[PDB]
Structure formats: structure tokens, C-alpha cells
Amino acid sequence: LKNAXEDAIAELKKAGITSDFYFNAXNKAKTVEEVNALXNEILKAHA
């Protein structure tokens, strides 16, 4: 967890988010708030 950026991509990629949705979640999320909310939303919805 050095930047909520590469770290989110890494965590979601290891989690397995359909195929590439996590990578699009990448250009959608800009601010850290979004990355954490729209991060948790993905992880929880695919828990």
C-alpha cells in the first residue's frame, strides 16, 4: 500500500475481477476517495 493506483490494480488483479473490469475501474477512479469506494465496492461485490 504505497499508492491506493498500483496497489488497487494489484489487489484486484490477484482477486480476479471477471477479466479486465478492474483495469477499467484504472481510468474511472482518479481521486483516492473514489479508489477506496469504487476498491471496496468491487472487492465486497465479488467477495
Curated annotation (Swiss-Prot):
Location(s), subcellular: Secreted, Cell wall
Span list, region GA module: 1-47
Function: Binds serum albumin.
Name of protein: Peptostreptococcal albumin-binding protein
Source species of the chain: Finegoldia magna
Shown residues in whole-protein numbering: 219 to 265 of 387
